[PDB]
Amino acid sequence: LGSFNGIAAGFYQGNWAMLLTALSSSTKNDILATPSIVTLDNMQATFNVG
Amino acid sequence: KNIIIKAHGQTNALIVTAAPDVMNDLERVIAQLDIRRPQVLVEAIIAEVQ
Numbered sequence: 001l002g003s004f005n006g007i008a009a010g011f012y013q014g015n016w017a018m019l020l021t022a023l024s025s026s027t028k029n030d031i032l033a034t035p036s037i038v039t040l041d042n043m044q045a046t047f048n049v050g
Numbered sequence: 051k052n053i054i055i056k057a058h059g060q061t062n063a064l065i066v067t068a069a070p071d072v073m074n075d076l077e078r079v080i081a082q083l084d085i086r087r088p089q090v091l092v093e094a095i096i097a098e099v100q
Binding site: 041 | 059060062
């Protein structure tokens with residue numbers, strides 16, 4: 001129960017029972033990276049972040 | 051004696067201090083050796099079901 005998510009509905013009429021179970025889950029993720037630099041032609045430049 | 055070719059790399063230009071009479075055999079060949087090059091776009095696709 002500590003981990004459950006969603007809904008479920010308790011019902012009891014004499015001998016029977018039933019449990020409905022459902023959930024909806026979604027997740028969205030975005031990123032963007034724009035680096036820029038200058039150097040001369042023949043010599044290499046390098047760049048890093050993180 | 052010989053043909054000594056030297057390349058600069060820092061202006062990206064090369065020299066020819068070799069025969070002063072048949073250099074034409076070099077101008078023609080470098081002229082046939084400096085040419086824009088086309089490039090190709092490759093994409094592959096895969097898909098399966100289990």
